[PDB]
Design a protein around this ligand. Sequence first.
Ligand SMILES: [Mg+2]
Ligand SMILES: [Mg+2]
Ligand SMILES: [Mg+2]
Ligand SMILES: [Mg+2]
Ligand SMILES: [Mg+2]
Ligand SMILES: [Mg+2]
Ligand SMILES: [Mg+2]
Ligand SMILES: [Mg+2]
Ligand SMILES: [Mg+2]
Ligand SMILES: [Mg+2]
Ligand SMILES: [Mg+2]
Ligand SMILES: [Mg+2]
Ligand SMILES: [Mg+2]
Ligand SMILES: [Mg+2]
Ligand SMILES: [Mg+2]
Ligand SMILES: [Mg+2]
Lengths: 88, 54, 24, 55, 361, 53, 110, 49, 159, 42
Amino acid sequence: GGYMMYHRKAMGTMKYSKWKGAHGGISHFYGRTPMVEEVRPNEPITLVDRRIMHYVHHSRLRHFQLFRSYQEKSNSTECKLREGEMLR
Amino acid sequence: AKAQAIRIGLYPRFGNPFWFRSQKFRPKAYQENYDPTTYSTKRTVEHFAYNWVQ
Amino acid sequence: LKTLDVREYRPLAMPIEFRFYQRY
Amino acid sequence: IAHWYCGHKFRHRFMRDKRFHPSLQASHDARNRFSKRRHFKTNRWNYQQAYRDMP
Amino acid sequence: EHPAIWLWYPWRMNPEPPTPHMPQRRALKNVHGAVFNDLTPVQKKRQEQMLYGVNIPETRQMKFEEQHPLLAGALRKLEGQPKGFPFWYRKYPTRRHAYEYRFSIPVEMLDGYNDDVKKALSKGMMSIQEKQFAQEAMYMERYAEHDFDTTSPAVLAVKRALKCRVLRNHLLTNPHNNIIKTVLANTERKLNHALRRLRKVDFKKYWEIIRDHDVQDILQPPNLVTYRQGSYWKYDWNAGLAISTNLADVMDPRGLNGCVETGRSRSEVARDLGLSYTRPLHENEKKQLSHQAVYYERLAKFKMEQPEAARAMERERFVRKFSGMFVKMDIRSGAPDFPSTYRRLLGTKVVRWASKRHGPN
Amino acid sequence: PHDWRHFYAQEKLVRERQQNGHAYGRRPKQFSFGARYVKTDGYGKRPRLPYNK
Amino acid sequence: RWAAKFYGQVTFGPRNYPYPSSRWLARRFQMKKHRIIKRFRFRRYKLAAVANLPFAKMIRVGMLPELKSSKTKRGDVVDPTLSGQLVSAVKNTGEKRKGQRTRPKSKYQV
Amino acid sequence: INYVPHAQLREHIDKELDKYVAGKNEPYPLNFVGQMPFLEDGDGNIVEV
Amino acid sequence: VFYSFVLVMKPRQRRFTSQALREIGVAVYSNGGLIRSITNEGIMRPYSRFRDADNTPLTYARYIILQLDMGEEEMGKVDKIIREHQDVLMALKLNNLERPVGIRSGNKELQAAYFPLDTFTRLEEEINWSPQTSADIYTQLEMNWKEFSRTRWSSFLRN
Amino acid sequence: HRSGKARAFVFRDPSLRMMRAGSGYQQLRRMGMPMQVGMGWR
RNA sequence: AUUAAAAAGGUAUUGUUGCCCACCAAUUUUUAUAAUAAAAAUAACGUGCAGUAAUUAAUAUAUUUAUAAAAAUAUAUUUUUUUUUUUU
RNA sequence: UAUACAAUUAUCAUAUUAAAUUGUUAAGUGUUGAUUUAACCAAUAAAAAUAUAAAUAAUUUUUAUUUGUUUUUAAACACCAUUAGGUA
Ligand SMILES: [Mg+2]
Ligand SMILES: [Mg+2]
Ligand SMILES: [Mg+2]
Ligand SMILES: [Mg+2]
Ligand SMILES: [Mg+2]
Ligand SMILES: [Mg+2]
Ligand SMILES: [Mg+2]
Ligand SMILES: [Mg+2]
Ligand SMILES: [Mg+2]
Ligand SMILES: [Mg+2]
Ligand SMILES: [Mg+2]
Ligand SMILES: [Mg+2]
Ligand SMILES: [Mg+2]
Ligand SMILES: [Mg+2]
Ligand SMILES: [Mg+2]
Ligand SMILES: [Mg+2]
């Protein structure tokens, strides 16, 4: 069945399954791209990445994304969590 | 703003296209200067260290 | 219900709001 | 409180007294004190065109 | 199919939806439980007459000319030429008074400008909310006793009447916002107050408000119980206008009062001053009365022309007096209410009456 | 968060008085992912205030 | 709502107890409510209120001679026309007709 | 304010569609979004980027 | 302004763009309203590809700004006219232009209480600033204020 | 005790309790308010 | 040359070998008799192991499910134990 | 058997001066395939973002109105059953 992109089963690989959207160049992700890093000449992409990832992690975005994109939680438990977080 | 801008196609549904340009306007606070008001506990202890070692 | 205490449980704490509810 | 009036508990007595309390009496605003609920939602489905002899 | 059957499975919180179904869209009640499917032709006409536009009555141009003839003389010189001094200000005492163009712009201030501007501030360009405020200001002006008057019963009544109509048609379109159901009902209650105060202030404006906006439905006493206790009339006692009438212009006061030393009623002193205060009669009363007046002509003619039938009936009455329950007229026999004063007879001894009370007391 | 319950209550109170002093702790019913665009005319396409059910 | 939220007094703690109900007590009464509701479910209870009848007096429909669960107890006396109609209502409630609003179904409803 | 009347419509529309005509002697005006958009010639083909 | 629009349109051959804008203009004039400005902009590259009537996604589109004076009743008609036209990809509507966000909050307006005629007289451009605006207009503005304020009465009291 | 009688925080001023009693039944009988409609004490 | 000190709950009450939960027999007693009436006393037998943050945290409403405690889902919630970016 | 609640703050069911209601957007095809799960089984997978001002306070709405149950799957996720479907 139709899944969202952050869904578990989203991009499937099976005999039936096929990926949705124009997948290269100007793509399905066209204006949906959260970050863009032009790689400076003679710069390993491992620094690029670890900077991106540190960024998301310290601002608790990767937190949020991981959280909401795995399982469902009712608006009450979600409130309880965000407010508990904020109060701590 | 972001809502309108998006539905007119003048802003992306994700991401910040001005992220770098916008860095001027943000108070980037150098680890070398000290602002007495921070919730940064690292910077404080850093300058403590610096002066003690001095 | 069961009309009697199955558990003999005596908590000894006397929180002031439980007692004087006129003032708190 | 004599124990034989109204129910076998005490609070039943004071609950009947509330039908005699002065500031609680029935009027044009507070009505149907004793059965409110038998009359509730009684005319919801009763459609009555209001009365106009004047244009 | 026959009557609504609710069906409730007791483990479930609430019953199943009943029977051949209640009408799919819930009825819209007024404050008293009466139902309106839609606005009346008259109200409808009021909304159509608000929608397409409104106008200041030249009533105001007139009184502006007769009150301040100098200013109207100046404007009379200056027509079409652009003005830098607003001579017309007396004509519009209040911000609210100028409704013909948006943002309270008096007409003659528009003289020397572009006609695009003239079309930009015109009625057609108003929002709906603005247009309501237009209808409201014009009416408030018609019934106001001075310019800055709001609080007065007449003005209040009209503004509330309008607001009520608006909310009504609103609910006609988009069915469930119960916020506005409630606001409508509250407005209606406050309208009820304003009107019932009006008819004791002056009743003709009261009348023609009811005839203009067609609210007679919220003046209808809600239910028989509270009406019978005289708490519908009790209202204007509370509002304090209960004695306000100032008789002498209407209803000459001489025959309204009883005699204190004589003890004769007002019907009496009226009789003696040779006056008749008698409310207009419907058909019932005229007919009963006219049938009563003539008992003696009928009787006279009867006993003259036909002594036999008469004499038979008389035999009946006469012998009857000697038969029957009581012959004697004492405190017992002469109890005006027999079942009431002896209730203690009613089950066992006396079988005539099933109940101890047939009247107020 | 429950230690701050009084605070939260203050806001529930507010959302109730906006509703004519009625529905306490009530919230708008969640709808559907496609709520607006799958529903025909005459049916509510967006979640209402709870008193406005 | 018609039915009762609770059975017995579920908020009984000392004054100023800063909750409607303690865990213990609410658990007891959840037991009570549980037993009652289970009794209603297994005995296949049915009630009705009819238009133009005293409402607070509810005909026991689960006790009618047709719909009765027991093969022994004498059920109840309800007028032949009204009984036929009640039977037709209970019967036509069961299944989902397309276009009607979906309403929750159970074994015990039938 | 210059209001477009009904008589002046297409004249104005066309004066506007020719704002960026892909050649001129003078500096070009920007957007409301503050961009220099594609210069199209007569008939709206995408000539200068 | 009373109303505004941003109209994202498919970049067609000019006769078609002229036709379409004439359709919309005639759809405004019919309904008894005015046009303050119909502003043209170029063919831009948006952040979102748009699909037109053919469901063929579009990388480029022409932007066109509308500023109108209507009633709010039959702008409903104008609106469902506009959104239903095949060559209008998107339309965003601004109804807030008479009372924008920045005014009438806790006596923020000096010498008056919400004078409405300020933001009506105005066009959209000066209510909502475009990115390129810099400190330079701070000069231009006043050379256009002082100047205006000098000649207004003289010019108005002529006729 | 949610289910049970309200208790005063402190006592009631007895003096004040006697001051509120002026119009009570006994003082009324002594004023002669109620009508004597029956034989009464012998 | 790799690590370790500091924050925590109990329906029990010398305390988890602690206590409790429902069905499943007899009986006792009141009644407003719904598969097999309801409710209250109760000390057998047999099934489990529901609860005490308690072996998928609990509590309330809602709907469903059922040898028996109860279990699944939808909401609210802590009488459950906390983990904490003032533009990076 | 009779013999003196509270009235300054008390959590389960008798509400009441309130500004809402209405918005048509998004997403979809290249190719030969072990995705999700602690673990099973059916089997295209992508997606649905915009509104403030304003509505005057109280006095007869309590048979009136009102407190998360909702047409359309030929649209999915999700949930329930297990390859047949239900529901959404
Ligand atoms: Mg399917
Ligand atoms: Mg104990
Ligand atoms: Mg303890
Ligand atoms: Mg008598
Ligand atoms: Mg008798
Ligand atoms: Mg017995
Ligand atoms: Mg029993
Ligand atoms: Mg459990
Ligand atoms: Mg256990
Ligand atoms: Mg557990
Ligand atoms: Mg539970
Ligand atoms: Mg339950
Ligand atoms: Mg079980
Ligand atoms: Mg349960
Ligand atoms: Mg109560
Ligand atoms: Mg459906």
